[PDB]
Design a protein around this ligand. Structure first.
Ligand SMILES: Nc1nc2c(ncn2[C@@H]2O[C@H](COP(=O)(O)OP(=O)(O)O)[C@@H](O)[C@H]2O)c(=O)[nH]1
Length: 176
């Protein structure tokens, strides 16, 4: 659509960014969508690690699950220095996991080396009946308690491509 126009604009952009959130929160699906189902994936530093380097065009994305490999957390956090932005993805329909996930976001932004980096929280799976909306996400994840930086929250759906356009707008506009 116009969505396809933003995808093209987005992959010419020279930026690093990070996509992190709990497992099964829609992370790879989201890349699928904005990459039109074609991209390169490479475990970092090598195979065996949770961390993945998505590349396509000029964009490189550092992608990991919070809780995939707890031992390597510090290594992952530190790898996310210098990024243009943080995309923190949550399943807005899985309300039982909201508290735990809200906590690792706050933990993540408590870290000095990641000071000042913009955060887009995405409340995915909006299509599922009863999934948390934008206002509620902000509420239940205490997003107003984060003010050391620029922080934005959108509700989206990868399976329906709802709000992916404004997401790409946000991202494209936040390259350094
Ligand atoms: N209903 C719905 N399911 C989704 C959406 N996005 C992803 N999923 C599903 O959520 C599950 C986890 O997806 P995945 O991208 O692999 O999660 P990841 O571990 O965060 O990368 C899969 O079954 C997806 O098909 C969405 O917007 N709506």
């Amino acid at each position: 659509k116009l969505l396809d126009w933003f995808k093209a604009l987005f992959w010419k952009e020279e930026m690093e960014l990070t996509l992190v959130g709990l497992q099964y929160s829609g992370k790879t699906t989201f890349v699928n969508v904005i990459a039109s189902g074609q991209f390169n994936e490479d475990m970092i530093p090598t195979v065996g690690f949770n961390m993945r380097k998505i590349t396509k065009g000029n964009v490189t994305i550092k992608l990991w699950d919070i809780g995939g490999q707890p031992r390597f957390r510090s290594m992952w956090e530190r790898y996310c220095r210098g990024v243009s932005a943080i995309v923190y993805m949550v399943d807005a329909a899985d309300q039982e996991k909201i508290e735990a996930s809200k906590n690792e976001l706050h933990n993540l932004l408590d870290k000095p080396q990641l000071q000042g980096i913009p955060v887009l929280v995405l409340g995915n799976k909006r299509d599922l009946p009863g999934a948390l909306d934008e206002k509620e996400l902000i509420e239940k994840m205490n997003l107003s308690a984060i003010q050391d930086r620029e922080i934005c929250c959108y509700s989206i759906s990868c399976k329906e491509k709802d709000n992916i356009d404004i997401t790409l707008q946000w991202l494209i506009q936040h390259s350094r």
